[PDB]
């Protein structure tokens, strides 16, 4: 009864630093099998079969795209540019991560450079924090005067997806199913 | 305010930037190579110019960091790799002059050709015509005519621009803080580290000389036997203890002695092994032979191939209007993408080429896990050595038997084994001394020990004194014979081979001594041997992060080249060579067709 059709068949996906967040309620997930092509399911506080025995209050279902090598970094206590500067989670994360390959739908022969991810940041990012500001980043003592280069670099950087590259660089869509149980009234039901 | 961090972020940006540009350029090059068009060559030219300018700009920007205050090995190595630059120090006028001179070489070397003076009408291009003449000619006068005509048509045009080029390059190399262009070329082997890992420039020439000095006698013996067999081939024509004429070596320059095989078979009744008949009879194809090669590769302990390989690689000619090129080559586009392009025939030769190409690509994925500036081999000859070790391993009668392409009732023919070993030895041992000779000549010319008026004189003197091959006619200094080869004409170093053979023999011996082989080193098969593959995996996947001296040790047991496997492999031929008991040792090299 959720827009799982919309959240799973979204035509376009936002950039890593501009990742989207939605709120769902009043319905239940009923995944059958194999929808996570990359059988990826790493969630701890619940069980894949026992998840139907629980209800949740707050949901943060994110959606973005990453290259092949960096899909490992989506885990608590992990390091790497994506982890430190784009997306961070606390040590008590509770959510089942889904990822699958969509090279047949998100790649073009001419080369796709419409996806961005931040590379430079002054300090480690706080959990569940988004920095969409395009302010210039500085690295030296003398001040740059609006002209780039020479110890002042633009932060953002493109992906560059192609259809003939290997699996290690193939784009996968990533969905994080955040949940939490508190005093708030039940919002998500189950297979009653 | 740390130049270490400054260079760190510099390389952090440069990695992604160079990776994207390189993938685009490689894709364009492959698209051009598959199908040829004027639009394709326009794309080639524009992409090449854009990369030239872009890399020059990036190197100039990266030249603004020091090297005496960097501590980290890896950061220091990356900084050295990015700082090593060329074609930027020279001014615009000198750079344009050098570019025009090089283009003049690249044009006139291919343009110049000679024809028959006796019959002006009948003469074709160099590619089919003179090659066919050299590979199917048995006439002294005809071979001499072709050889002299080409050597008198090419050099008289290649000499002046080459001299100006060498002077300009010497000037630039001196200006770039190097001793000379020869020193710059030799400076591709030095490695800097502690704990007795220092590698200077003189070590390379020292080890090369030490190897050649103790390897020469086997060449002497095989030269004596081949000279006797060639006397049997052609009568009353050559001196008995002299040299082999340059036009009787199968080809113009005598790079390989492969054409003399039908003229040295000890036993006509028992010819060399020819499984090509059964190969054609079994009626297999390119897909089948490549599946067999993949199975052999897997049997050692190396992993499976990629799906995109079979998905996109082309092996059978479509036969449509559009044309392609049928020269097998190894392609490594990067970004976890590997492709091949070849046209397949059913022979042992194509078996070996397919296996060698598969080994090349295997190495390519092996070192492909490193960052972009580190996706490269330890040195130049590692790829070909890795291909050739397994080529020799897979070129043995026991292997061709245990894949079941040979009748069970066939008994191991030591005579056929000796024939195959003689063929391989006559190729390999004859290949290298010419390469060492030519590289020494080129280095001497570049550093300047050979003056202008002594080029050809020193070339011929070194030729005679090293190899023992004489010239049939006198020549003057206007000719530029040593530049007749494409590598010399187009400025390519020839030291990557002699090195490659040494590494080949060392790796073969090291890998076969561990498989618990019972007989001599030769004929060893590594199939169904996991430990050899496990040991070789670290060698294959090390990359260029570690120095090559450190890397080679982890497999060999020593960090310096040695030639013991060559002698231990070729010992059976030495023991056989009772046959030539009437052979005199030594020569004078004083008999030539001039008298």
TrEMBL record, chain B:
Role played: Essential counter-regulatory carboxypeptidase of the renin-angiotensin hormone system that is a critical regulator of blood volume, systemic vascular resistance, and thus cardiovascular homeostasis. Converts angiotensin I to angiotensin 1-9, a nine-amino acid peptide with anti-hypertrophic effects in cardiomyocytes, and angiotensin II to angiotensin 1-7, which then acts as a beneficial vasodilator and anti-proliferation agent, counterbalancing the actions of the vasoconstrictor angiotensin II.
Residues that hold Zn(2+) 2 according to the record: 356, 360, 384
Binding site for chloride: 189, 496
One of the record's GO molecular function terms: peptidyl-dipeptidase activity
Amino acids binding Zn(2+) 1: 356, 360, 384
Coiled coil, from the record: none
The keyword Acetylation is assigned to this record: no
Catalytic reaction annotation: angiotensin II + H2O = angiotensin-(1-7) + L-phenylalanine; angiotensin I + H2O = angiotensin-(1-9) + L-leucine
Cofactor binding, note field: Binds 1 zinc ion per subunit.
Cell compartments where the protein resides: Apical cell membrane; Cell membrane; Cell projection, Cilium; Cytoplasm
Membrane topology: Single-pass type I membrane protein
Top-level division of the source organism's lineage: Eukaryota
Record's protein name: Angiotensin-converting enzyme
GO biological process terms held by the UniProt record: proteolysis
Protein family (similarity comment): Belongs to the peptidase M2 family.
